[PDB]
Every structure is written in C-alpha cells, then in structure tokens.
C-alpha cells in the first residue's frame, strides 16, 4: 500500500511521502515485490 501496489504499480515517490509525513521517518521505498511501503 501507500503507492507500493506492486512490481508494474510501484510508487517509491508516493510512498517516500508517506513516510516522511511521518514524524522520525526521513522516507519510504517500496519491498517485497513492490507492495509493502518501507518507511526509514
């Protein structure tokens, strides 16, 4: 989710907002073909 939908539906943008609209997250890249929003 949160732009991850995976491999062909891979939002590493959509999903770097997310997580840096996150507070003590700097960004979010897409995992695990591409579904699973990885927030650091």
Request: hydrophobic letters at 20%; charged letters at 20%; one cysteine or more.
């Amino acid at each position: 989710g949160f732009g991850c939908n995976g491999x062909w539906n891979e939002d590493d943008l959509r999903c770097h907002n997310h997580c840096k609209s996150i507070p003590x997250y700097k960004g979010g890249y897409c995992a695990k073909x591409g579904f699973v929003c990885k927030c650091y």
